[PDB]
Design a protein around this ligand. Structure first.
Ligand SMILES: [Cl-]
Ligand SMILES: [Cl-]
Length: 227
């Protein structure tokens, strides 16, 4: 009962969870998949109960409000709207997420990627979203000032006006597109491949180049996936 498309007015109130499987390919061994993509809203004062995670790293993109993230080992970080946070989680450690406001709610999008826990990676990283047409916000080596992932994944944040476009060269054989707000379509080889309404996702296979075109004011993600 989210209305779309031009204003997509209540996007910050939307709550949903995608849960996806783990891909295998005999020619691409041991690589990670996108396992969850969710958007959640926490009420003023509210706070999820601590939880362990199943061999995944967690990337949060704060859309509205502010939150604090704590773990059972004493590590802590706060994130406000406009920031992305990566938690490279550790076996048997519990993690909590609290809304810092007693007055105002919190909205955030969260991705889980499979992780090889023995791979080195900083426990906590944050990145300030620049909000330009496209930004690389996470990558294997933290190229171009991006969050460093211990997966072979490149994550892009897209902000376009209606009718604007952005082109992407893909490293892996799989891409996932996500509408954060607004509608858009993807082209490959100058031909339409998929059209996404507000809040849609779409996996796209074996395209080395993808062009995204906004059909209303848009915020989106494009995830370049290794298998
Ligand atoms: Cl990987
Ligand atoms: Cl496809």
């Amino acid at each position: 009962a989210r209305q779309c498309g031009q204003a997509d007015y209540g996007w910050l109130q939307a709550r949903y969870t995608f849960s996806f499987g783990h891909y295998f390919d005999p020619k691409l061994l041991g690589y990670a998949s996108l396992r969850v993509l969710n958007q959640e809203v926490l009420a003023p004062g509210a706070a999820f109960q601590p939880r362990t995670y199943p061999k995944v790293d967690i990337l949060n993109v704060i859309l509205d409000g502010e939150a604090e993230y704590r773990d059972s080992e004493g590590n802590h970080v706060q994130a406000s709207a406009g920031e992305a946070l990566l938690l490279s989680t550790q076996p048997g450690v519990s993690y909590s997420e609290h809304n810092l406001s007693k007055d105002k709610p919190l909205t955030r999008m969260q991705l889980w990627l499979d992780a090889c826990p023995q791979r080195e990676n900083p426990l906590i990283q944050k990145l300030a979203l620049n909000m330009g047409k496209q930004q690389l916000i996470a990558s294997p080596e933290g190229a171009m000032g991006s969050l460093q992932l211990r997966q072979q994944v490149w994550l892009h944040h897209i902000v376009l006006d209606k009718g604007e476009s952005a082109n992407f060269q893909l490293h892996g054989p799989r891409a996932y597109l996500q509408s954060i707000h607004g509608k858009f379509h993807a082209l490959t080889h100058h031909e339409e491949k998929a059209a996404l309404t507000c809040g849609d996702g779409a996996f796209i296979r074996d395209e080395a180049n993808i062009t995204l075109v906004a059909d209303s004011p848009l915020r989106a993600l494009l995830i370049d996936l290794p298998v």
